[PDB]
């Protein structure tokens, strides 16, 4: 996250860290708890490591540096990537993760509310993006979960800044014209949440963007409302 600030406990209890353990362990992507055994993230997080064995999912954690060999984590039972996902264009950048064991819900580990299929037209005015990614281009993973408040931008405005790629109605953009606040490397898969009526709703999944926090270069997110049929089909008992 560029231009953000440090989060406190319980602000973002759905936020998870997807880590890979090969010879060393490292955070690779964010994700959102949506059910006792379900995490929604970006398909691109599994480009390269599509097998479940190397993954460890940490929930109920604020500060990655607080993680030790005794910290509990979840394992992956199944990775469900959208069938139409295309790496080069970032279309259908969405994946579900089934956890091997259901998590108990706590004030620091609980699901985010998902939008309604009709929310495709909803205007959200108070949106935030969170994660442990770089605080600047060519930066480093951040220890404390960062948060930043960013306005949503129209598809029309977003398309102008990305003439080399199509911005679809299944994508939502967010960013400042003067830049300075944005997601970045390592925030991939994490949530874009909007607050209305005291309730938080998952609106976007961090997907792609040119650089980080550059002027007139909004970030691109998977628009969750546009995948609600897919999500409910794939998570059906």
């Amino acid at each position: 996250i560029v231009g953000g600030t440090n989060s406190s406990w319980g602000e973002w209890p759905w936020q998870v860290s997807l880590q890979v353990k090969l010879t060393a362990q490292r955070h690779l992507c964010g994700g959102s708890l949506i059910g006792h055994q379900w995490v929604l993230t970006a398909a691109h997080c599994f480009d390269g490591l599509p097998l479940q064995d190397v993954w460890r999912i940490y929930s109920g954690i604020l500060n990655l540096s607080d993680i030790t060999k005794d910290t509990p984590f979840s394992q992956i039972k199944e990775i469900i990537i959208h069938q139409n996902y295309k790496v080069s264009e970032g279309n259908h950048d969405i994946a579900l993760i089934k956890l091997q064991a259901p998590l108990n819900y706590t004030e620091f580990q609980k699901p985010i509310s998902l939008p309604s299929k009709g929310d495709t037209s909803t205007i959200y005015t108070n949106c935030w993006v969170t994660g442990w990614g770089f605080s600047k281009e060519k930066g480093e993973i951040q220890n404390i979960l960062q948060k930043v408040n960013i306005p949503l931008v129209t598809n029309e405005e977003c398309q102008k800044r990305y003439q080399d790629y199509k911005i679809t109605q299944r994508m939502v953009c967010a960013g400042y014209k003067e830049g300075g606040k944005d997601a970045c490397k390592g925030d991939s898969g994490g949530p874009l949440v909007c607050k209305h009526n005291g309730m938080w709703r998952l609106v976007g999944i961090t997907s792609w963007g040119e650089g980080c926090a550059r002027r007139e270069q909004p970030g691109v997110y998977t628009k969750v409302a546009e995948y609600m049929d897919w999500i409910l089909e794939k998570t059906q008992s």
Binding site: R26, H27, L28, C29, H44, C45, D47, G48, V87, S88, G90, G133, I141, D164, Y165, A183, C184, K185, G186, D187, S188, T206, S207, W208, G209, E210, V220
Partner: peptide
């Protein structure tokens, strides 16, 4: 890697 990838190793 995609041109505007956020993937850490990209």
């Amino acid at each position: 890697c995609p041109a505007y990838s956020x993937y850490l190793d990209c």
